[PDB]
Design a protein around this ligand. Structure first.
Ligand SMILES: Cc1ncc(COP(=O)(O)O)c(CNOCCCN)c1O
Ligand SMILES: Cc1ncc(COP(=O)(O)O)c(CNOCCCN)c1O
Lengths: 405, 409
């Protein structure tokens, strides 16, 4: 099923295919959860990106969703790839992507994995520490290093212990140390984060990147690569929309990294490309009614926080259950909870929402489930991952062909 | 020590512990390039746990909670030992049966089961299933009408580390209705189960739960059921590194069982221990793959290791685990210690294993050990960011294998 793709007829959307599949399973017993993945939506996101950020080459963050069909489509489109490990490099290269379209954007890499990158010609890596410089000097000495600088996320849960990113003070020492060890530093990267509330953060980061560029010029480096990272939204169901962010980013890029300077600008978008392309259908497998006389309901579905909905814990996701069958306007709603299939009491998807009374065998839909869902799912309790059905229309395939030409 | 892994088992020589095997493996890869994280799993420790259970709960037949750690070697060892198996899904039943366990040693103890999975259980002769709701009775009537149902009742698990009663368990009031409804539908109810909560803190919960079970048994007698099966669940600790030790709990359980369910009554008592059997059997070794020095002049350190909260240390989030990093060489008393944090390998900023602990200054290539990592660790790990599951090295001494032979006879 991984390399299986289905045709999407004219005048049909992913929602229609979802509905169709549901209605054909009504008689049968087998009602496992499943995804519909529209690869056309990914081509749409690429066009949108080419329009909004024409100076910025996108490098897809594979960790977001490592589905071979996703990476194959993006590779045909001509995007780069951000890989964080040996396995992701193997995946991307197995699909025929050359090393110069891969950035190894993990600042803290196991020596053996750095060695693997060196053996397969992946030259560009990020770093933010001296120990990383020593490891690179011993294990991949001809590497092109990108210094990752810190960004301020005022909304982060742990503000005093940031995992990644060098301060400006530390950046100067890192550049001088890299000069000592005869290691080539070719640019700067930063990551604003997914939970960005104010686009001005990007401007500050770009300004900071410029500052580090100047330091590199002082130490004797020929800096050309600016990596503005990821964190762009993957659906329209957010307060801060993609185009607002890009409208703030482009003037900053023109001001601080003008095209005549010879700078090459890239980004590492993960969720932007895939979030909205995947829709999840889960089946209500069990039901309890609790009287409070106000009726309330507990619904158990066949995916949970150990599966696709791990994003509730790891990605701070807020999931919105949608009904497959549109409800009548006068239908009565009830206070309801939604639970996953496992034995664990913390396997709860929705604490409290308003739903009409539903029945075992009814379906619930979750949109915008492409990013950091299947990539981090486990088989706790023995429950297997939902099948993914890939779809693509004819015109979407034509568009992909145009990109290949 | 190099594997051939699932069914590979290494000899543990006399006078050698799992710790010694760890040392040997570490010193063996000293100059080598590849220092991936790995487990040492002592199947001897699982056999010792079984012997300890037989001594402490002689009336209670243990049914291993496969979901806790579904490694084939553990299930195979426990099956040779003669334990039962608590399975939560079709896949776990397939695993247990594939290792040759007959269905009468399997309880399907998931109270809210997908219809197709109930059907699978019926198709493979797994008769005994738990339930706590009317809709479950409807599904059973339709998909497994000859099933032997066990009513799961609620418990006061407020002091337990992992509360399960919010999600599962019928009140006594509801239990009366469930038994009457089951009678209407001509479904056989044969007993009661409960779960005190994983990581029990107060053994008195068991006493109340046992009492509650007695009442539901009596309710069944009123409606015409011949109840014989009492299932006292799990929640037992898996290491000695806990305030509430196994033998205190069993000392509270046994009198209650004698009072409410005397042996002459013909009751059959089982339990569903998960972490008790496997927690201390697994020790995890991780390598320090990266290092940062942060000046405060007070020096602090940030260590990055090659397993994290998406892998084995998911137990930090899901299992409320508190992990203690251990050094391979126990440190000298005069060595200087530093405030330190430990981080996983992934790009995620939330991938932090230890916020603050005191460690001597360590270096890339040094190892850290985590004991008691057998329960709810590997079973719920993912390959996020492409980082692979740690290799498991199974070891067993000769005497341990002899003990397993005695159990198998
Ligand atoms: C260095 C880096 N580059 C890209 C991304 C992807 O960001 P996205 O566009 O998906 O927001 C990341 C992601 N890092 O953490 C994501 C954690 C989500 N649970 C990078 O680190
Ligand atoms: C129904 C059931 N039976 C046994 C167990 C295991 O209990 P243990 O002996 O391991 O404490 C469970 C566990 N349920 O949830 C555990 C989630 C732990 N993160 C059952 O549900």
């Amino acid at each position: 099923e991984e390399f299986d793709c289905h045709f999407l007829d004219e005048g049909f959307t992913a929602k229609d295919i979802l509905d169709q599949k549901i209605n054909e399973v009504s008689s049968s017993d087998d009602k496992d959860a499943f995804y519909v993945a529209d690869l056309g939506d990914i081509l749409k996101k690429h066009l949108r990106w080419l329009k909004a950020l024409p100076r910025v080459t996108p490098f897809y963050a594979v960790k977001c969703n490592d589905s071979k069909a996703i990476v194959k489509t993006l590779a045909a489109t001509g995007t780069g790839f951000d890989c964080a490990s040996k396995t992701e490099i193997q995946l991307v290269q197995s699909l025929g992507v050359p090393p110069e379209r891969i950035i190894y954007a993990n600042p803290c890499k196991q020596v053996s994995q750095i060695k693997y990158a060196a053996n397969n010609g992946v030259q560009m890596m990020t770093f933010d520490s001296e120990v990383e410089l020593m490891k690179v000097a011993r294990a991949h000495p001809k590497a092109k290093l990108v210094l990752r600088i810190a960004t301020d996320d005022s909304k982060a849960v742990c503000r005093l212990s940031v995992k990644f990113g060098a301060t400006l003070r530390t950046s100067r020492l890192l550049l001088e140390r890299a000069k000592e060890l005869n290691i080539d530093v070719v640019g700067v990267s930063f990551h604003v984060g997914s939970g960005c509330t104010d686009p001005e953060t990007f401007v500050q980061a770009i300004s900071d990147a410029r500052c580090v560029f100047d330091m590199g010029a002082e130490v004797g480096f020929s800096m050309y690569l600016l990596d503005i990272g990821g964190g762009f939204p993957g659906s329209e169901d957010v307060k801060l929309k993609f185009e607002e962010i890009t409208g703030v980013i482009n003037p900053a890029l023109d001001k601080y990294f003008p095209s005549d300077s010879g700078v090459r600008i890239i980004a590492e978008p993960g969720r932007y490309y895939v979030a909205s392309a995947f829709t999840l259908a889960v089946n209500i497998i069990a039901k309890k009614i609790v009287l409070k006389s106000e009726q309330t309901f507990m619904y158990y579905v066949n995916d949970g926080v150990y599966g696709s909905f791990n994003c509730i814990l790891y990605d701070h996701a807020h999931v919105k259950p949608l009904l497959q069958k549109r409800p009548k306007p006068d239908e009565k709603y009830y206070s309801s909870s939604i639970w996953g299939p496992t034995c664990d009491g913390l396997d709860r998807i929705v604490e409290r929402c308003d739903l009409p009374e539903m029945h075992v065998g009814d379906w619930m839909l979750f949109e915008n489930m492409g990013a950091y869902t299947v990539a981090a799912a486990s088989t706790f309790n023995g429950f297997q991952r939902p099948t993914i059905y890939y779809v693509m229309s004819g015109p979407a395939w034509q568009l992909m062909q145009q990109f290949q030409n």
